Design a binder for this molecule. Structure first.
Ligand SMILES: [Mg+2]
Lengths: 165, 352, 90, 268, 367, 54
């Protein structure tokens, strides 16, 4: 969907200083710090003007902070339930696999304002296994409509399909 | 060679430089507030002075079409010239043809000639127009302030390749700063010669080789320009309208030195009549220190001192830190031209 | 036009519009759910609703119960905003 | 009696931070409107004690007050002073209660009872609008050629002088021509500042009719405002104490709604 | 042996270093705002200076094919040398040659000879160029700096092996900071067209403190001996840093001011005297800014000398002021082992202490 | 017997420790942001110092 592609492109065009500014704002809200608010407004407001179906402020802020921390390369078809699920085929089934699965499954009982730390640990698990690509646009689209059952069903089904291979 | 001119001058509040809000310009020096006059004001005052009328051969304008439609005589060339200018690229963001062009008042005839040619295509016509405005730099006022032209590629033509349109400046001017603390005005809310003047220090630097090079090797014109610049700087008021400078110091060096640190400590006087004199004294102090702390062997430095009727001396009453003292401006100009080699003031006026 | 181009808090020249309520969107919009505001007041109102879950009813600047808050937020901007960051858009 | 008030603005400090007070002085119309908002009606103040309702000029008193803006006051700080002379007591705590960022000092007000005898020397400062009314032929287009139109325009334009006369002499003559009528005689007059004053005014313009009826949809169009300003300071002598007091509190020129008429007098 | 240079210098209102928006650079020190000048600006100003001209033999260019073309003569070699540089690994990707090469090697005739040799393959000639680039190591501009290059591996050939390209710089320069609170101001300008028919700029004024550190042994090692060249470099660096300024907006803000105080120290370890200005200098009516700054520096220097004294390594220093204008030990202390009123004798004393060298013969080694 | 050393030290503008991005390290103490120098960096600087050479 147009509106998210340009948002991710603008995020990928940032330089070291803006990435550090967003990095130092992790775990914080949009209103308390002014430089982060100004940077987010400059990056986001024209997109909301031009496109009505642009991502909401909370999801965009969360995605910006996550991208600033992790800095993955955008690639279509590399969504989270595939890389996580292809990784889960190399762990010990008895002990490590349930521990990873519980952390992956905990996301279904949290709202968009509490999905920073679990996503952080999931992306750290990804980074520990030499992963350099991720689908940011797809992740944003899923996170926008996280309160719908078919979205979660498709998420889990994709995870299972990737895992059973 | 580098010609350095230091001046001490008094100015009235009615002949000052103002900002957007209408307040006189001021700066911070030594941690305290001082009065300021910008360098652009001095440059444009010297450019449009009476003594510089014989050396004004430059136009900075955004209306090249109007200037072109003042020589052809035929009324049927205003849209063709505008189209050619747009083809060249003289159009910045928004507006319409608002790029400042700085050239000389002698190649406009060539622009009219190319514009008035109906046997030439538009693209090569624009190329010829650019070639005409890529060499119009034989103006003494351009050789002192420089030029910089960047045509936009937003509406640039197919090829219309541009040449070098950059001229390096040969004159450096610093902002004039008050010697004393800025004096407040009188409040009319406490209600139930007309105003004090302000003392300023001015610094100019001129490169001889750069001025010679920019004038295509001409040498008499450079001397005439130097003399006219000195006379205009000594004999003009920034905005408004004898008021001769109280002290002028002329030096010939190889590296630029600024004596603005002689007034880090402000000059404070109970009596207003002893201001200027004491200011001069401080200057001498600093100069002596520099002349004894930053130069020896290689190439020495000699200087001329000018005061009106020799009213104020700068020699420590014993030191020969000035080669000679001159009581007239014309004699000072003649000596300055003589040091560069010959260049009598009478025979140099026969040049533009 | 109705507000005479005056901000509803500081009475400064107005350039932006704040939506009091979101009963209708796009197709219908009466000029009674909108208020005229300047840049600083609009920014303060935006930063005062980021995580409150107001949904339909947003801040009404005419209500006194918000005034003491809004000015406070404005102060923060005047203390911390950098004009060189809004310029040079990143 | 007369009421004299003083307001102070910083116009300095860090240039990388918002400065609403310094930006407020870029439009003379905004300054005039803000100063006019200091005279509320007796019903508006009761209804709105916090100045948090839409602003309508019909709810504020109309009274010909005068003001001037001075700059360059020192003491290691920059200041812009606004001096207001009125026939009514201003209400500054109602106008700036939500805009305390604008000022750098609390507003001050005081009474003023000027009583001057005949043949008294005074030191005066005042700003004038140098304007004359003329018939001008209408030249238009100028698309490489000037095309004349037969209409003659009645227009107020700037005062001009000859090539052999300085602006100071022209202004001194222009003021001494009218000084018989005002009630004083000049002794010396010198020009300090000569320039322009700019502003912009909104105006409603109809666009489309209302489908439900009872009005239009309307929009705002901006009209420029340009004035020629000249500041003078000098010495005067009172002719008769009757007409001089009429000259004060009235103005000595046009554009009195944009800070262009005010005599400041000191006893010398 | 470590040579430390400290400078106190006052500047007239100007703008010598600005960011992409034209505002002069600033920093935070001691919790307060100060003016700042970047170290790279000072290093480049010293590099491209009249005093430091006889020792300039290094070039940093993004276009090495043009120099080869000029050196070759009237022949054509742009495409061949350009492609050879492509397969050397100088990042052809992104349409830019962003790889900046600091190979000094001003005798670039060797690259021409390899380029102008119609007997070797396109790969071997790419190996000789790489082998000859990484061996210059001369031109003392890289005796003070140098991390010469780091080649790109993805776009290079698989038959070229690079040698070491690290020079281990022997010069340390700190960012200049003001001794007081910075006050930035805006100047408003107008185009003022000529034919009948507001802008914003930034400037400020401050008094700066500058610090330089030179390592003698590393400087000698980087030149492969040649102590005379090292002494010449030290003297020319002192002379250039003493009298030179950044060439930024000097056509409208002429600020060719000279430093008010110079302190030269010899010690085995580096110490910076910036903490003398944690408390910003406030101007009183009985003195000026420079004198108060010099007094604070004197206090801090005396306290540091008394607090960290070791009998196994005494510290020797010289103090220079123009015509002894501003003494260092105003009240009671003879902090400086020698007070000198002229710069040339200061350079001579520095050289004499360093090696007993004289300023005359060391100038005969131009290199 | 335990020996405890406490030091207070002010530094000029610099970058003594960086992360992968190239930004100086930071932390949150008392609810506010502060600069940080890693303990391992201090330990290795002490180990390689000239005073610990012997
Ligand atoms: Mg507002």
């Amino acid at each position: 969907n147009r509106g998210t592609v340009d948002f991710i492109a603008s995020l990928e065009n940032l330089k070291e200083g803006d990435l550090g500014i967003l990095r130092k704002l992790r775990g914080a809200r949009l209103d308390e710090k002014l430089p982060g608010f100004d940077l987010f407004s400059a990056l986001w407001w024209p997109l909301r003007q031009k496109n009505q179906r642009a991502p909401k402020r909370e999801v965009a802020w969360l995605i910006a902070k996550l991208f600033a921390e992790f800095r993955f390369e955008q690639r279509e078809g590399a969504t989270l339930p595939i890389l996580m699920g292809g990784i889960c085929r190399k762990l010990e089934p008895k002990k490590e696999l349930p521990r990873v699965l519980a952390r992956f499954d905990q996301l279904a009982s949290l709202d968009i304002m509490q999905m920073e730390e679990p996503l952080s640990v999931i992306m750290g698990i990804l980074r520990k296994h030499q992963q350099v690509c991720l689908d940011w646009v797809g992740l944003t689209d899923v996170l926008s409509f996280w309160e719908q059952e078919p979205v979660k069903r498709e998420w889990s089904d994709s995870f299972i399909k990737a895992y059973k291979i | 060679m580098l010609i350095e001119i230091h001046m001490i001058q008094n100015h009235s509040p009615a002949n000052l430089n103002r900002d957007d809000l209408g307040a006189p310009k001021t700066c911070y020096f030594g941690g305290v507030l001082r009065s300021r006059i910008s360098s652009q004001c001095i440059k444009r005052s010297i450019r449009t002075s009476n003594d510089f009328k014989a050396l004004l051969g430059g136009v900075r304008t955004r209306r090249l079409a109007d200037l072109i439609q003042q020589e052809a005589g035929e009324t049927e060339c205003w849209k063709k010239a505008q189209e050619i200018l747009n083809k060249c690229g003289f159009k910045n963001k928004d507006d319409n043809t608002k790029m400042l062009v700085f050239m000389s008042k002698d190649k406009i005839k060539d622009l009219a000639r190319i514009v008035l040619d109906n046997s030439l295509g538009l693209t090569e016509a624009a190329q010829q127009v650019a070639n005409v405005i890529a060499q119009a730099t034989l103006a003494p006022d351009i050789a002192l302030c420089g030029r910089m032209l960047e045509p936009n590629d937003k509406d640039k033509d197919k090829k219309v390749k541009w040449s070098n349109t950059t001229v390096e400046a040969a004159l450096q001017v610093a902002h004039a700063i008050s010697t004393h603390i800025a004096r407040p005005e009188i409040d009319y809310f406490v209600a139930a010669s007309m105003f004090a003047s302000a003392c300023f220090y001015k610094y100019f630097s001129i490169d001889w080789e750069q001025l010679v090079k920019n004038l295509k090797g001409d040498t008499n014109l450079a001397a005439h320009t130097v003399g006219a610049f000195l006379l205009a700087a000594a004999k003009t008021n920034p905005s408004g309208k004898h008021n001769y400078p109280d002290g002028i110091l002329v030096e010939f060096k190889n590296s630029p030195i600024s004596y603005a640190n002689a007034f880090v400590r402000p000059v404070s006087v109970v009596k207003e009549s002893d201001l200027v004199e004491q200011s001069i004294g401080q200057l001498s102090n600093y100069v002596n220190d520099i002349r004894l702390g930053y130069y020896d062997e290689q190439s020495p430095v000699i200087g001329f001192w000018f005061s009106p009727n020799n009213r104020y001396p700068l020699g420590y009453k014993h030191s020969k830190l000035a080669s000679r003292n001159i009581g007239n401006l014309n004699e000072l100009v003649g000596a300055v031209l003589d040091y560069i080699g010959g260049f009598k003031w009478e025979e140099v006026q026969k040049s533009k | 036009v109705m507000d005479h181009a005056a901000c509803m808090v500081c009475k400064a020249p107005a350039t932006t519009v704040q939506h009091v309520n979101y009963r209708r969107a796009g197709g219908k919009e009466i000029p009674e759910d909108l208020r005229a505001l300047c840049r600083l007041c609009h920014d303060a109102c935006t930063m005062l609703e980021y995580g409150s879950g107001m949904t339909t009813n947003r801040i009404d600047p005419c209500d006194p119960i918000w005034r003491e808050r809004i000015l406070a937020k404005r102060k923060e901007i005047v203390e911390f905003r950098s004009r060189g960051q809004r310029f040079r858009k990143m | 009696m007369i009421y004299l008030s003083r307001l102070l603005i910083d116009t300095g400090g860090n240039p990388d931070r918002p400065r609403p007070g310094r930006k407020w002085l870029d439009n003379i119309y905004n300054v005039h409107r803000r100063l006019s908002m200091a005279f509320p009606s007796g019903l508006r103040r009761e209804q709105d004690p916090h100045f948090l309702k839409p602003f309508s000029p019909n709810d504020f008193q109309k009274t010909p007050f005068l003001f001037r803006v001075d700059n360059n006051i020192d003491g290691n700080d920059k200041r812009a002073i606004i001096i207001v002379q009125s026939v009514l007591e201003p209400d500054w705590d109602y106008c700036f209660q939500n805009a305390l960022d604008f000022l750098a000092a609390p507003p001050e007000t005081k009474e003023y009872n000027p009583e001057f005898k005949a043949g008294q020397l005074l030191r005066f400062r005042l700003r004038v609008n140098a304007s004359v009314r003329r018939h001008i032929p209408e030249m238009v287009q100028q698309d490489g050629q000037t095309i004349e139109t037969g209409k003659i325009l009645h227009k107020r334009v700037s005062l001009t002088w000859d090539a052999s006369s300085t602006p100071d002499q022209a202004l001194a003559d222009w003021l001494a021509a009218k000084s018989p009528k005002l009630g004083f005689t000049l002794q010396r007059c010198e020009l300090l500042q000569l320039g322009w004053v700019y502003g912009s005014k909104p105006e409603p313009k109809n666009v489309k009719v209302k489908e439900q009826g009872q009005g239009y949809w309307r929009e705002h169009k901006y009209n420029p405002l340009r004035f020629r300003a000249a500041l003078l300071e000098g010495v005067l002598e009172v002719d008769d104490p009757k007409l001089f007091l009429k000259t004060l509190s009235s103005g000595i020129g046009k554009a009195k709604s944009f800070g262009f008429g005010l005599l400041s007098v000191l006893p010398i």
